[PDB]
Amino acid sequence: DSKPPYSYAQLIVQAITMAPDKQLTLNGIYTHITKNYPYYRTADKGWQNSIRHNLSLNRYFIKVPRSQEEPGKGSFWRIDPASESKLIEQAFRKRRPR
């Protein structure tokens, strides 16, 4: 019974960093937050699209328009070179100001 969430700008970062490729689709966060907590998906749909909100609030992510129909849709939130190391900094951390 443990569903400890993280920062809204971390649930995207902490994911792309643990992904073997440095690139994740929007669902990426939906497949990471759960990989950690037990459910955090079949009960609260307020955090689902919630991540898509931080995907833009931040801009070091490589949000490209079209692609190579690899995923099927033209959209993907990745991590640039001078971006990952940056967000992973505010992600590996947590939400607690002084």
Token representation of residue 23: 């690139």
With vertex at residue 66, the alpha carbon angle to CA 71 and CA 54, rounded to the nearest 5 degrees, is: 80
Known binding residues are: 55-56, 58, 61
Cβ atoms 88, 13 nearer than 8 A: yes
Residue (of 17, 54, 53, 48) closest to 33 by Cα position: 48
CB atoms within 10 A of CB 92: 12
63 contacts 55 by C-beta, under 8 angstroms: yes
Instruction: Output the CATH code of domain 1-98.
Output: 1.10.10.10
Distance, CA of 13 to CA of 29 (rounded, Å): 8
Residue list for the binding site for Mg(2+):
55-56, 58, 61
